[PDB]
């Protein structure tokens, strides 16, 4: 359900290009192509 | 994404049947309709 940067950041996650960095779980995208919404 | 209760709970979040309570934010669902995967920022 998470597909835009504002929603991602509001959820306490971080937007990153191409992949979530180690430890983080992917919970969605940030809308722009390739971006991942990543929760530590 | 998170769309089932096992994925949700493994990450240390809660599964709530209606809403994320005070201090928690929604990070997905727990599969069943209306359920919310919730975690404190």
GROMACS .gro file of C-alpha atoms in nm:
model
   81
    1UNK     CA    1   0.000   0.000   0.000
    2UNK     CA    2   0.298   0.232   0.019
    3UNK     CA    3   0.390   0.389  -0.313
    4UNK     CA    4   0.490   0.758  -0.256
    5UNK     CA    5   0.771   0.935  -0.060
    6UNK     CA    6   0.547   1.132   0.185
    7UNK     CA    7   0.358   0.815   0.289
    8UNK     CA    8   0.686   0.624   0.322
    9UNK     CA    9   0.848   0.892   0.543
   10UNK     CA   10   0.532   0.934   0.749
   11UNK     CA   11   0.542   0.559   0.832
   12UNK     CA   12   0.888   0.600   0.988
   13UNK     CA   13   1.066   0.438   0.690
   14UNK     CA   14   1.336   0.578   0.453
   15UNK     CA   15   1.330   0.605   0.069
   16UNK     CA   16   1.638   0.463  -0.107
   17UNK     CA   17   1.736   0.420  -0.471
   18UNK     CA   18   1.741   0.066  -0.612
   19UNK     CA   19   1.775  -0.147  -0.298
   20UNK     CA   20   1.713  -0.143   0.079
   21UNK     CA   21   2.043  -0.133   0.269
   22UNK     CA   22   2.135  -0.423   0.496
   23UNK     CA   23   1.910  -0.479   0.798
   24UNK     CA   24   1.615  -0.293   0.643
   25UNK     CA   25   1.292  -0.459   0.527
   26UNK     CA   26   1.119  -0.348   0.210
   27UNK     CA   27   0.765  -0.229   0.285
   28UNK     CA   28   0.683  -0.053  -0.044
   29UNK     CA   29   0.817   0.187  -0.302
   30UNK     CA   30   0.854   0.567  -0.305
   31UNK     CA   31   0.679   0.626  -0.637
   32UNK     CA   32   0.976   0.728  -0.847
   33UNK     CA   33   1.090   0.432  -1.057
   34UNK     CA   34   1.330   0.204  -0.872
   35UNK     CA   35   1.290   0.358  -0.527
   36UNK     CA   36   1.229   0.144  -0.224
   37UNK     CA   37   1.058   0.223   0.104
   38UNK     CA   38   1.280   0.070   0.371
   39UNK     CA   39   1.210   0.012   0.744
   40UNK     CA   40   1.500  -0.040   0.983
   41UNK     CA   41   0.578  -0.538   0.124
   42UNK     CA   42   0.394  -0.662   0.428
   43UNK     CA   43   0.061  -0.830   0.363
   44UNK     CA   44   0.039  -1.123   0.609
   45UNK     CA   45   0.057  -1.165   0.990
   46UNK     CA   46   0.376  -1.376   1.000
   47UNK     CA   47   0.578  -1.123   0.799
   48UNK     CA   48   0.438  -0.846   1.020
   49UNK     CA   49   0.505  -1.007   1.357
   50UNK     CA   50   0.850  -1.133   1.260
   51UNK     CA   51   0.956  -0.769   1.210
   52UNK     CA   52   0.844  -0.691   1.570
   53UNK     CA   53   0.527  -0.502   1.473
   54UNK     CA   54   0.167  -0.558   1.585
   55UNK     CA   55  -0.134  -0.677   1.382
   56UNK     CA   56  -0.441  -0.462   1.471
   57UNK     CA   57  -0.787  -0.545   1.329
   58UNK     CA   58  -0.914  -0.182   1.270
   59UNK     CA   59  -0.649   0.099   1.329
   60UNK     CA   60  -0.291   0.172   1.442
   61UNK     CA   61  -0.309   0.291   1.803
   62UNK     CA   62  -0.143   0.597   1.957
   63UNK     CA   63   0.230   0.625   1.879
   64UNK     CA   64   0.223   0.352   1.609
   65UNK     CA   65   0.234   0.407   1.229
   66UNK     CA   66   0.100   0.173   0.955
   67UNK     CA   67   0.373  -0.019   0.768
   68UNK     CA   68   0.148  -0.274   0.588
   69UNK     CA   69  -0.146  -0.508   0.639
   70UNK     CA   70  -0.187  -0.853   0.800
   71UNK     CA   71  -0.381  -0.997   0.502
   72UNK     CA   72  -0.732  -1.017   0.646
   73UNK     CA   73  -0.945  -0.724   0.531
   74UNK     CA   74  -0.907  -0.407   0.742
   75UNK     CA   75  -0.611  -0.535   0.937
   76UNK     CA   76  -0.312  -0.308   0.992
   77UNK     CA   77   0.058  -0.390   1.050
   78UNK     CA   78   0.168  -0.118   1.298
   79UNK     CA   79   0.507  -0.017   1.440
   80UNK     CA   80   0.641   0.277   1.639
   81UNK     CA   81   0.867   0.506   1.429
   0.00000   0.00000   0.00000
